[PDB]
């Protein structure tokens, strides 16, 4: 009984080969041979950010692009201000352990979550002005790997077990569930329109869910190993992954099949973070190796290197209005680059 | 104007008292412990935290050096990707039961893992091998389990340079340092980083198991620091 | 005759061995600071004791090479204020190895704490127990048996007024490095690993002990002018002063050189500069 | 994508010889540690084998070495196991697995119920 | 057993995504490469922005 079902899925798996290399009509790189380099990319950075006291494993960017929260192992929750390296909040965390962060579009809220598999909610405007867990989130099984709100009283969270899951703060109970994963789940990125999000997991595969119906619509199976971080695309039909082959690549939701791979042979060392330009021409990638690189999204060549770092750069972010790029690192330091003329 | 200055003097004030509770926590931070208490199955750890929802804590102090000692609970069977949030801590309890399938392989397998990690090579490791009775009416009993699941059990022979026991039986304690030397094998193969490993015997039940893991501890301190003046 | 040009010349080397020691004693030392206070990843007790140690180098080789080329009213006053100067500095250096020597004896043996905040003792006795050691000698100087700025100690109770502080924290760094040594072969003899291993626990005892076995130096610090007759005589005279420019030399480099992590800074930051300019 | 799909397997007497081959076809052979597991029809999943990146460091899991022959040919993308000798208890399920990154001499999660890097089963029985 | 229902809904779902229909990758890099170029200029890390606007100067 079991070998008619793995035949015919074998045999669907062949139709959708088949059907993707019968798509394939023309190359990327081979269309963007005739378009003039990028050039030499060189930034330097401006400010460090020297406040933690343990590594850093999340940073995410404040819609205004001026405020940054990062966590640490520490147990600890800094609000920095970016142009003038100050501080604004503090928020010591129950538990220690956290593996992710992410600063609302409003403003008002910052998550974070980690082994203690729940997610804590901080509303930093109170009348008190003090920083206090507006809410628990509790159902997850496994360890919290990435969440990013999709609005102010809804929130997608990835965890450890193969499930990722749709919360509503106002109640506090799980929404929507999305099954389908084989691994651990291990990163996450939302939509530019908040319709669609892709989950990147440890099964060395990636999946297109939408929120409103709750299922998965296509499935990108290009990788060879984990999936540690995932970037749309600006323009919200494409979006990038890294592994730990060492290799980014570009995948399309249109054309569902990869675009161009973005290896090299110098480079042995596992993919940690993934972002995007503004206007996507540039792919900052971090690494093992201690550096981070700087590709062209559309011709796969090294356009500039961001070394500087003294441990492993964990996190990665490049502010929404498109000036500064943020790396944060496992040696307690975030540093925040740009370029000038 | 006077508004951007009053704006810039509160955002001062406020990274000022942010920056003195910082300082204030930064020495309880370096002074506290931090263990990671990572048994592979169930071969005593029960016991062990009586003895002293995602990870639990047991603060235990002992002559005025804080401890934290962290059990993975509900966390999957996969560790590969949550395991590099521990190497950080100063040491990693490993417990083994040296009594489904062979236990003893399994528990060899991820210590070996854990030794050759990238990112915990730079790690300590504290081995507690319990069920020292029960391996012992194992042996006693006649039972075909370390015999037939090791072949090298047959040409080994117990070291002359330890025998503390005081009338246990000659099988069983070369049992017990066969399996050390297996644990020990294994962390001598690779010394690519700067780490130690601390096999002990945890047989008694009594308030001696908290003492090794502070003496430990304290040579994993001391090790650190002398390594990092360039005198070890 | 030959055998006094030999001693002449013998005398000439010396000397200009001594300058030579004393100048690649401050070229190291301003090198180490440079890069202890520019390189700014090494900011912690351990990096600001070197410094500070470093620092009192610079003191002790200043002043001893500006007294020794102002040596023969204005001269008067600059001379003695040079020999006080020397004095505060020779104490002062073997006051900060001490520190070191405390310091790292606290953080290897008292048991939990790992407290930051005592720096602020570290530096006050670092910087000021050989303030209160000299300034009574040169107050007991100046008042009785002035001479014109400074001379051999022709009392044993000038002589000890200015050197026995100096012999009490020595003996106290001996013990303490007795203890650090016997710390560190019980964790050699621990692990059993091999003679190499062995003989290493000897070798970072003489290479952390020589400072201490500049106690030869100070002792016959004051050289006289004209040597007595024997062979001995200028051996030693060439010795203490060889082994005062290379224990200066020594310090600057296998103190704060030797340790891996400021190594691998700094290869890091070459290699970034290499090819932020490439 | 990396579709580990094993051969061999079957009845055989005690004493017995067999041959397991796996078939990789996703990936780059030559980064990756590859290592068998089986797992009895009763019992859990059990690592029995394994060989490095390039075939240098063998080991094996106790109660099989020198009956148990693990090689691969990172030319045709192979890897093999030649088992010989059988008795009734290795009568179990065989899994090729793979650890999850390259150039790595450790690899953590082999022997668990929900891997995503091993292939499907290859009934061996002894009777 | 679970084997049964894990087959089915692999199955259910791989037919469900291959009853979408795909987009000519010469199209969809034509497209990429429209919006890259069309949003080229307004890109402050592409282009540096002289330092008398720079947040970050």
Redesign the interface.
Same mark, same amino acid.
């Given at each position: 009984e079991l070998d008619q079902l793995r035949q015919e899925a074998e045999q669907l798996k062949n139709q959708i080969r088949d059907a993707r290399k019968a798509c394939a009509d023309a190359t990327l790189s081979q269309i963007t041979n005739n378009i003039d380099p990028v050039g030499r990319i060189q930034m330097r950075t401006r400010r460090t950010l020297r406040?933690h006291? +343990?590594?850093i494993?999340a940073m995410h960017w404040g819609t205004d692009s001026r405020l940054l929260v990062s966590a640490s192992?520490?147990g600890?929750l800094?609000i920095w201000?970016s142009y003038?390296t100050?501080?604004?909040? +503090?928020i010591?965390l129950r538990?220690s352990?956290v593996?992710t962060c992410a600063y609302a579009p409003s403003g008002n809220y910052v998550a974070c979550g980690?082994?203690?598999?729940?997610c804590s909610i901080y509303n930093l405007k109170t009348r008190e002005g003090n920083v206090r867990v507006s809410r628990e989130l +509790?159902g997850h099984?496994?360890?919290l790997?990435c969440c990013r709100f999709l609005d102010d009283n809804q929130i997608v969270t990835s965890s !450890?077990?193969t499930t990722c899951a749709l919360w509503d703060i106002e109640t506090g109970q799980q929404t929507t569930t999305f099954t389908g994963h084989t !691994?651990?789940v291990?990163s996450l990125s939302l939509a530019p329109d908040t319709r669609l999000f892709v989950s990147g997991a440890?099964d060395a595969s990636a999946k297109l869910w939408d929120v409103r119906e709750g299922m998965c619509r296509q499935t990108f199976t290009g990788h060879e190993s984990?999936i540690n971080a995932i970037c749309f695309f600006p323009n919200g039909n494409a979006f990038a992954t890294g592994s730990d082959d060492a290799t980014c690549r570009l995948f399309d939701l249109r054309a569902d099949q990869e675009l161009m791979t973005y290896s090299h042979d110098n480079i042995i060392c596992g993919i940690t973070s993934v972002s995007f330009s503004k206007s996507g021409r540039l792919l900052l990638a971090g690494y093992d190796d201690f550096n981070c690189n700087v590709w062209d999204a559309l011709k796969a060549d090294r356009a500039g290197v961001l070394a500087g770092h003294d441990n492993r750069v964990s996190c990665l972010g490049v502010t929404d209005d498109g000036m500064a790029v943020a790396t944060g690192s496992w040696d307690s330091f975030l540093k925040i680059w740009n370029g000038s003329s | 104007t006077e508004d951007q200055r009053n704006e810039?003097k509160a955002?001062?004030e =406020? /990274?000022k008292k942010?920056?003195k509770?910082?300082q204030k926590?930064?020495?309880v931070?370096? =002074?506290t412990h931090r263990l990671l208490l990572l048994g592979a199955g169930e071969s005593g750890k029960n016991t062990i935290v009586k003895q002293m929802?995602?990870?639990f804590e047991t603060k235990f102090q002992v $002559?005025?050096? /804080?401890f934290h000692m962290?059990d993975?609970g509900?966390?999957?069977?996969?560790?590969?990707? %949550?395991?590099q949030?521990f190497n $950080?801590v100063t040491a990693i309890i490993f417990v083994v039961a040296s009594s489904?399938? /062979?236990r003893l392989?399994?528990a060899l397998?991820?210590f070996?893992?854990? %030794? /050759?990690?990238?990112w915990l090579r730079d790690t300590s490791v504290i081995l507690f091998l319990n069920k020292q009775d029960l391996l012992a009416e194992k042996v006693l009993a006649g039972k075909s389990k370390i015999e $037939?699941?090791?072949?090298?059990f047959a040409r080994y022979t117990t070291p002359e340079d330890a025998t503390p026991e005081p009338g246990e039986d000659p099988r069983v304690t070369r049992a017990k340092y066969f399996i050390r030397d297996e644990f020990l094998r294994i962390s001598t193969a690779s010394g690519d980083g700067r780490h130690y490993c601390y096999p002990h015997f945890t047989c008694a039940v009594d308030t001696e198991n908290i003492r090794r893991v502070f003496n430990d501890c304290?040579?994993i301190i001391?090790?650190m620091?002398?390594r990092?003046?360039?005198?070890? | 005759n030959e055998a006094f040009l030999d001693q002449r010349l013998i005398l000439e080397r010396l000397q200009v061995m001594y300058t030579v020691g004393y100048s690649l004693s401050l070229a190291t030392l301003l090198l180490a600071l440079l890069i202890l206070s520019l390189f700014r990843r090494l900011h912690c007790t351990?990096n600001y004791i070197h410094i500070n140690l470093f620092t009192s180098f610079m003191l002790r080789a200043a002043a001893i090479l500006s007294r020794d080329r102002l040596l023969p009213n204005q001269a008067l006053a600059a001379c003695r204020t040079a020999q006080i100067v020397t004095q505060y500095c020779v104490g002062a250096n073997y006051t900060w190895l001490l520190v070191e020597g405390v310091y790292?004896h606290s953080?290897?043996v008292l048991?939990?704490?790992?407290?930051?905040?005592h720096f602020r003792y570290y530096l006050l006795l670092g910087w000021g127990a050989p303030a209160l050691f000299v300034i009574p000698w040169v107050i007991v100087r100046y008042l009785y048996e002035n001479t014109q700025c400074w001379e051999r100690n022709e009392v044993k109770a000038i002589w000890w007024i200015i050197r026995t502080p100096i012999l009490m924290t020595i003996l106290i760094n001996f013990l303490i490095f007795i203890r650090?040594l016997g710390?560190?072969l019980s964790?050699?003899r621990?692990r059993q690993m091999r003679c190499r291993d062995y003989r290493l626990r000897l070798a970072?005892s003489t290479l952390?002990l020589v400072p201490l076995l500049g106690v030869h130096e100070v002792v016959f610090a004051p050289v006289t002018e004209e040597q007595a007759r024997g062979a001995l005589r200028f051996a030693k005279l060439g010795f203490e002063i060889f082994l005062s420019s290379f224990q200066g030399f020594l310090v600057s480099v296998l103190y704060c050189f030797?340790?891996?992590?400021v190594q691998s800074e700094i290869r890091r930051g070459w290699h970034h500069c290499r090819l932020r300019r490439s | 994508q990396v579709q580990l799909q094993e051969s061999g397997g079957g009845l055989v007497q005690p004493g017995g010889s067999l041959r397991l081959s796996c078939a990789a076809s996703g990936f780059t052979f030559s980064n990756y540690k590859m290592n068998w597991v089986r797992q009895?029809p009763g019992?859990?999943?059990?690592?029995v084998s394994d060989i490095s990146q390039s075939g240098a460091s063998i080991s094996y899991?106790?109660?099989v070495?020198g009956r148990f022959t693990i090689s691969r040919d990172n030319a045709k993308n192979t890897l093999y196991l030649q088992m010989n000798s059988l008795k009734p208890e290795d009568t179990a399920v065989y899994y090729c697995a793979r650890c999850?990154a390259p150039f790595?001499?450790?690899?953590?999660?082999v022997?668990?119920?929900?891997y995503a890097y091993r292939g499907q089963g290859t009934q061996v029985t002894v009777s | 057993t679970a084997s049964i229902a894990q087959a089915r809904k692999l199955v259910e779902q791989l037919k469900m995504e291959a009853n979408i229909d795909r987009i000519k990758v010469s199209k969809a890099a034509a497209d990429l490469m429209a919006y890259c170029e069309a949003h080229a200029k307004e890109d402050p890390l592409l282009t540096p922005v002289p330092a008398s606007e720079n947040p970050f100067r």
């Open positions: 406040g006291l +343990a590594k494993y192992q520490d600890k800094i201000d003038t100050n501080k604004v909040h +503090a010591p538990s352990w593996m980690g082994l203690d598999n729940i +509790a099984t496994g360890y790997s !450890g077990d !691994g651990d291990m440890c984990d | 810039e955002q001062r =406020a /990274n942010i920056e509770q910082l926590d930064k020495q931070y370096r =002074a929802s995602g990870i $002559d005025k050096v /804080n962290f993975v509900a966390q999957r069977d996969e560790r590969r990707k %949550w395991i949030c $950080d489904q399938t /062979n392989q399994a397998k991820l070996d893992s854990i %030794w /050759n990690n990238k $037939d699941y090791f072949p090298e304290r040579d001391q090790r620091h002398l990092q003046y360039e005198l070890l | 351990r790292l953080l290897l048991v939990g704490g790992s407290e930051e905040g650090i710390i560190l964790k050699l621990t970072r952390f030797i340790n891996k992590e | 009895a019992k859990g999943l059990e690592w899991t106790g109660s070495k999850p790595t001499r450790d690899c953590f999660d022997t668990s119920t929900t | -």
